[PDB]
Amino acid sequence: APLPELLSNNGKHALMVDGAPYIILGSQTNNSSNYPDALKDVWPSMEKMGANTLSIPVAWEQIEPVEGQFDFSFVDVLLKEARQRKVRLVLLWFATWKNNAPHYAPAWVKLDNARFPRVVKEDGDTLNSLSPLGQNTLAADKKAFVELMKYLAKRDKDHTVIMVQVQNEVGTYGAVRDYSPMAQAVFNAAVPDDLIQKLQLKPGTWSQVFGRDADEFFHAYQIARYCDEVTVAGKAIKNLPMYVNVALRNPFNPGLPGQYSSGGGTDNVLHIWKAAAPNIDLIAPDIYFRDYKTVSKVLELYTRPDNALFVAEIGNDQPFARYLFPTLGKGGIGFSPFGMDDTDYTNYPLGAKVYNDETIEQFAQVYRLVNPMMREWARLSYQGQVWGVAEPLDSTTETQKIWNAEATPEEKEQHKKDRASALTQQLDLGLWDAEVTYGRPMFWVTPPEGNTPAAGGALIAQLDDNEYLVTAYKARVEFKPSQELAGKKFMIERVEEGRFEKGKWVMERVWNGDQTDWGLNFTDRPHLLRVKMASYSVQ
Amino acid sequence: APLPELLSNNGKHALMVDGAPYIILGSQTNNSSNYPDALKDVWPSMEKMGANTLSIPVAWEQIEPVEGQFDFSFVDVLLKEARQRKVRLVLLWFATWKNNAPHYAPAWVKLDNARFPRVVKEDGDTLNSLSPLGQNTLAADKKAFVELMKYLAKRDKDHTVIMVQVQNEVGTYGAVRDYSPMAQAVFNAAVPDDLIQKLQLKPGTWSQVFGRDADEFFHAYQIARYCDEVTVAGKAIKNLPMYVNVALRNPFNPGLPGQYSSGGGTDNVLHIWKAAAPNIDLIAPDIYFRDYKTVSKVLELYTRPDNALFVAEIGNDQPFARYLFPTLGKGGIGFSPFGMDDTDYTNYPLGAKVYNDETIEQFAQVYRLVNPMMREWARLSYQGQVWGVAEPLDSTTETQKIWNAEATPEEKEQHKKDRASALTQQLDLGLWDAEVTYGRPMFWVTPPEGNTPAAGGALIAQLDDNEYLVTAYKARVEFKPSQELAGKKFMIERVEEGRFEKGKWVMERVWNGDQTDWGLNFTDRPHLLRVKMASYSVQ
Ligand code: NA
Ligand code: NA
Ligand code: NA
């Protein structure tokens, strides 16, 4: 079977798996589930979720517990159990950095600062974050990563593993960069030529060329180079797609580097990362912001002509499930909720307060919309036109409930109108537009009041000028002409509910009458529709 | 197999069973379950609880219903059923005293006051409490107890019965001592030499040597001698460990002897009991105080270089389960909740209002932490260093809930701070300290607010200078250096979850990342951890 690969063309992207575009409908384990005995607490969640791909760590400490006495016994069991369940894997290389720190590096690495040095603050104190200028550290990480890739080259010829994350949330908290003498010598030197050329900049030292951003851009550059080298060495063994995942700064109100993880692929240093690390396939956001506006901004910033969108981690609380829709609508190649296992941990406040079947079911319900068309959707996303939206108001707060109640009757009616309007989205589909609304009956035209909790969304793919594939969730989708018709009228020509079997459309039933008089109304159950529209003459 | 025995060395203790230290994770029946037909209502509770030892009465009235005519049919059945279930037994000899009174003595004893005399009050009235100076009573009790011990010598060679309680809550309510002419004659006489020598006192009569404490100390001494003689006679037949259990006085606010049970092993007469009864292995508190401060004080007073801690009875309501932790932390040899059977009785207000699976489960959940390491814990407790803590605030009262709500915003914030601080415990583990906190998320650092109801605790054993065995319940445990290091930093080197198999540690998984970033967080599920800490140079 051909290698998985990330294709980029015409500002669009596809993750090719087994020779065709693929969507990762993912689940990711908690951080301590990377052992054979823990897998029994991972698989059942995956099954309940309907996930097709598991993201799970492989730690440097476990594969090289003594230097270089390699142990791949976890990987062996993981591959075999994944294959039995017919799912794919994304392995997460937890090594020099995991959330800025070396906790998953072997004891012989993390306890030997002389050989493998830490970031030194400007005031001389040391942080528990390994410096990207540590040459021994790079060589050692690289060597172990190579051994892992050799294991996959020899033992995973059908590519059960489809992608590898290199490190996990790199960077440093508590300082902007390494200020050690070793780092200071490089910082005081000339900015490397290659970076100067790629950005279109005048030569100089770091402070001269970057000014107020020199410290942060320096750290980003050095980390990016470190990760790029590890990536190249591993890809020389087996050329799987590889990516890095970002501990995000708030895109609207980031604060200072060091408060956020400095040097990772934050939105202000994507240009540094892309210039410095041409061998890393994509830079993936880890999304734990709950609110629609911030999440939407993150999806906008990380979807670029030079960057495929992969939501490598997202919170597992209920409000996060609907972000699958805009993720896919942007041409995203995947989506992977974090902490989908029963190993007795909840990362609340970041995710769900409790982990049970209801937690899983919020994601299972949205994955059920995509699974039955996964390959067809992936192709259309890469080659054609897709759209995707989520319910754009967050669930009403207790503070907002109080303020709501204390309001004048005129103000309450105005608020309802404001909410209805905010809960109405327009999509321009060429000759036709769609209007998506949330939280209303399936009959008549009473205005939308939203779902409680906020949960809805819709996916649309264009099949032809007048024909669309549509599936949605707790929402109404209504079609209309995109431009004035000139003495023509319009209608729905035909709505079919069905499925793809061996790549061919099979009709189950025609929606008509009540089911198409008031838009196309979706609840929590999965329905995949082919909608054909027509303008017609009445002259 | 070798006889069970209580060892005492270097101010520490162990209950040896089958040649190694043992922890009684007990259950005790209600008072009327000591019959073959009642056992079907006892065993299922034991199984649901995960108890390893059953405490159950054997009554003088049932073994010698007619003088001279012994009946061990109950004991026969009990032994056989216990063996089938692979549990051990502690038999409770209910004889001359059961809660101060002779109700479990045969009719031919308790109805013959001439032969077997009662305590006489100073005013000449009689109380239903047998005088410890009644020589016929002592001889008769002793004779029956000897027959019981003969039955065990001949019919329990593998020591299904590991310990015997001699009497049950001895003493007298309603008077301080016996004031009968017979007792008055002894009280007026010289204090016995042996007691004078052992306490380091000047000879004299009771009033002269003890003053204001003479009446109470006299009753304690006489009862202690009576119980010691019974104990010696039984041990001459089979030398099992034997103990007495105490109807406690409130250690902070006891009131007067006679209001509490005068003459039992209350905290003010332990010195009398130890001097008078050298053959009784230990003196065990019966704990029905609900509140942390009082329970903690009782555990402190009963844990002594000359007294192994055994919580021979404790209430079976929810708040009591967490006291297993400090019991074991003090080097306790056992813990036995009272009334764990379904014989249609609740001793509420002393225990739980209702008896059902939930009542049992509160104890099952904490026994599940200890059972998998029972032998390893018992050894470490005897030979090494252990610690144990329980959540130190009791559940918030309705009165405190009202007061909390009516409070000013500044006062509410101060109260939360005060509670957080009270819900934070420090333990000095040598080179490392642990901080235990209760009722907080498993991620980030928001301050502890306590569990509702109060329920948490933690056990720690030292394996080496930098390595500890840890298990806890509804709590967070965080490690730090015990002393400022000098230009060194520190981290967790490794946390392994696992179990002991044939006395050897088997690793199941490594806790890392999220699972160790914010201390070690436990819910209601059992996890046994080996925690290795490291200081490291950054010079
Ligand atoms: Na248009
Ligand atoms: Na210390
Ligand atoms: Na200290």
Q: Which of A28, A31, A169 should we substitute to test contact with B (largest number of B Cβ atoms within 10 Å)?
A: A31
The answer to whether A116 and A207 are in contact (CB under 8 A) is: no
Query: Which A residues in the span 95-114 are in contact with B, Cβ-Cβ below 8 Å?
Result: 98-99, 103-104, 107, 110-114
Domain boundary among B372, B387, B406: B372
How many Cβ atoms sit within 10 Å of the Cβ of residue B385?
A: 15
Three-class DSSP category at B13: strand
Are B509 and A38 in contact (CB < 8 Å)?
Answer: yes
Distance from CA of A41 to the nearest CA of B (A): 12
CA angle A12, A18, A22 (to 5 degrees): 40
Cα-trace Rg, chain A: 25
CA of B21 to the centre of ligand 2 (A): 27
Q: How far is CA B260 from CA B129, B246, B247, B268, in A?
A: 14, 11, 8, 12
Instruction: Note whether A50 and A155 are same-domain residues.
Output: yes
Domain boundary among A320, A344, A372: A372
Are B489 and A128 in contact (CB < 8 Å)?
Answer: yes
| Residue A433: domain span | 373-539
Instruction: Note whether B413 and B368 are same-domain residues.
Output: no
Could you say which ligand is closest to the alpha carbon of residue A426? Answer: 1
Q: How many separate domains does chain A show?
A: 2
Using a CB–CB cutoff of 8 Å, tell me whether B510 touches chain A: yes
Q: Which of A92, A104, A126 should we substitute to test contact with B (largest number of B Cβ atoms within 10 Å)?
A: A126
Single-letter residue type at A303: T
Instruction: Note whether B517 and B398 are same-domain residues.
Output: yes
The answer to whether B455 and B363 are in contact (CB under 8 A) is: no
Using a CB–CB cutoff of 8 Å, tell me whether A66 touches chain B: no
Q: How far is CA A12 from CA A15, A308, B419, in A?
A: 11, 7, 56
Partners of A289 in the beta sheet?
none
Pairing of strands B432-437, B475-481: antiparallel
Q: How far is CA A40 from CA A52, A77, A351, in A?
A: 17, 12, 22
For ligand 2, a single-atom ion, the residues with CB < 5 A are B 428, 482
Which token pair is B351? 């225990």
CA dist., res. B68 & res. B76, Å (int):
19
Using a CB–CB cutoff of 8 Å, tell me whether A126 touches chain B: yes
DSSP string for residues in A375-418 = HHHHHHHHHS-EEEEE--SPPPPHHHHHHHHTS-HHHHHHHHHH
Tell me which residue of B20, B55, B84 sits closest to B334, measured CA to CA. Answer: B55
Surface-to-core class of residue B171, CB atoms within 10 Å of its CB (0-12 exposed, 13-18 middle, 19+ buried) = buried
CA dist., res. B27 & res. B360, Å (int):
10
How many Cβ atoms sit within 10 Å of the Cβ of residue B49?
A: 23
The torsion angles phi and psi of A478, rounded to 5 degrees, stand at: -120, 135
Q: Torsion angle of alpha carbons B9, B10, B15, B21, nearest 10°?
A: -100
Q: Which residue of B has its CA nearest to A98?
A: B513
3-state secondary structure A299-348: HHHHCECCECCEEEEECCCHHHHHHHHHHHHCCCCEEEEECCCCCCCCCC
Could you say which ligand is closest to the alpha carbon of residue A385? Answer: 1
Distance from CA of B156 to the nearest CA of A (A): 42
Instruction: Note whether B357 and B399 are same-domain residues.
Output: no
Tell me which residue of B285, B226, B211, B215 sits closest to B257, measured CA to CA. Answer: B215
Single-letter residue type at B299: L
CA dist., res. A175 & res. B249, Å (int):
59
Instruction: Note whether B302 and B384 are same-domain residues.
Output: no
Q: Which of A104, A121, A245, A346 should we substitute to test contact with B (largest number of B Cβ atoms within 10 Å)?
A: A346
Nearest CB neighbour to B511, from listed A32, A112, A118: A32
Single-letter residue type at A160: T
Nearest CB neighbour to A99, from listed B511, B513, B538: B513
Contact residues on chain B for A348, CB-CB shorter than 8 A: 441-443
Instruction: Note whether B356 and B383 are same-domain residues.
Output: no
Instruction: Note whether A450 and A480 are same-domain residues.
Output: yes
DSSP 8-state secondary structure symbol assigned to residue A19: T
Tell me which residue of A59, A54, A34 sits closest to A43, measured CA to CA. Answer: A54
Longest Cα separation, chain B: 86
CA of B426 to the centre of ligand 3 (A): 11
Are B513 and A347 in contact (CB < 8 Å)?
Answer: no
Alpha helices in A163-250 (DSSP H): 181-188, 193-198, 206-210, 214-237
Nearest CB neighbour to B512, from listed A32, A118, A347: A32
CA of B324 to the centre of ligand 3 (A): 26
Nearest CB neighbour to B538, from listed A38, A118, A346: A118
Contact residues on chain A for B516, CB-CB shorter than 8 A: 103
Instruction: Note whether B406 and B287 are same-domain residues.
Output: no
Are B538 and A62 in contact (CB < 8 Å)?
Answer: no
CA of A336 to the centre of ligand 2 (A): 45
Using a CB–CB cutoff of 8 Å, tell me whether B486 touches chain A: no
Using a CB–CB cutoff of 8 Å, tell me whether A123 touches chain B: no
Using a CB–CB cutoff of 8 Å, tell me whether A33 touches chain B: yes
Nearest CB neighbour to B512, from listed A104, A107, A348: A104
CB-side neighbour CA atoms (13 Å) of A458: 28
Distance from CA of B512 to the nearest CA of A (A): 6
Instruction: Note whether A160 and A271 are same-domain residues.
Output: yes
CA of B518 to the centre of ligand 2 (A): 22
Instruction: Note whether B214 and B86 are same-domain residues.
Output: yes
Nearest CB neighbour to A113, from listed B514, B516, B538: B538
Contact residues on chain A for B442, CB-CB shorter than 8 A: 345-348
Instruction: Note whether A450 and A425 are same-domain residues.
Output: yes
Are B441 and A114 in contact (CB < 8 Å)?
Answer: no
CA dist., res. A240 & res. A6, Å (int):
9
- CATH no. for residue A467? 2.60.220.20
Using a CB–CB cutoff of 8 Å, tell me whether B115 touches chain A: no
Which token pair is A136? 């021994």
CA dist., res. A83 & res. A375, Å (int):
19
Tell me which residue of B53, B366, B91 sits closest to B245, measured CA to CA. Answer: B91
Could you say which ligand is closest to the alpha carbon of residue A434? Answer: 1
| Phi-psi group of A15: left, alpha or beta (phi > 0 → left; psi -120 to 50 → alpha; rest → beta) | beta
Using a CB–CB cutoff of 8 Å, tell me whether B487 touches chain A: no
The answer to whether B79 and B155 are in contact (CB under 8 A) is: yes
CA of A305 to the centre of ligand 1 (A): 23
Using a CB–CB cutoff of 8 Å, tell me whether A180 touches chain B: no
Are B493 and A111 in contact (CB < 8 Å)?
Answer: yes
CB-side neighbour CA atoms (13 Å) of A327: 28
Tell me which residue of A262, A355, A282 sits closest to A29, measured CA to CA. Answer: A355
How many Cβ atoms sit within 10 Å of the Cβ of residue A26?
A: 28
The answer to whether B85 and B46 are in contact (CB under 8 A) is: yes
Using a CB–CB cutoff of 8 Å, tell me whether B474 touches chain A: no
Measured in angstroms, the resolution is: 1.8
CA angle B153, B155, B157 (to 5 degrees): 65
Contact residues on chain B for A38, CB-CB shorter than 8 A: 508-509
The answer to whether A463 and A383 are in contact (CB under 8 A) is: no
Three-class DSSP category at A60: helix
CA dist., res. A127 & res. B393, Å (int):
37
CA of A480 to the centre of ligand 1 (A): 10
Domain boundary among A348, A372, A396: A372
Using a CB–CB cutoff of 8 Å, tell me whether A34 touches chain B: yes
CA dist., res. A117 & res. A392, Å (int):
46
Nearest CB neighbour to A347, from listed B514, B523, B525: B514
The torsion angles phi and psi of B338, rounded to 5 degrees, stand at: -90, 140
Using a CB–CB cutoff of 8 Å, tell me whether A37 touches chain B: yes
3-state secondary structure B63-107: HCCECCECCCHHHHHHHHHHHHCCCEEEEEEEEEEECCECCCCCH
CA of B428 to the centre of ligand 3 (A): 6
CA of A427 to the centre of ligand 1 (A): 9
Residue listed under structure tokens 């046994």: B528
Side by side, the strands of the sheet bearing A424-428 are: A424-428, A432-437, A475-481, A520-522
Tell me which residue of B516, B329, B292, B294 sits closest to B422, measured CA to CA. Answer: B292
The residue length of chain A stands at: 539
Contact residues on chain B for A57, CB-CB shorter than 8 A: 513
For ligand 3, a single-atom ion, the residues with CB < 5 A are B 482-483
Partners of B511 in the beta sheet?
B495
The torsion angles phi and psi of A70, rounded to 5 degrees, stand at: -85, 140
Using a CB–CB cutoff of 8 Å, tell me whether B534 touches chain A: yes
Instruction: Note whether B154 and B165 are same-domain residues.
Output: yes
CA dist., res. B264 & res. B256, Å (int):
13
Pairing of strands B53-59, B88-98: parallel
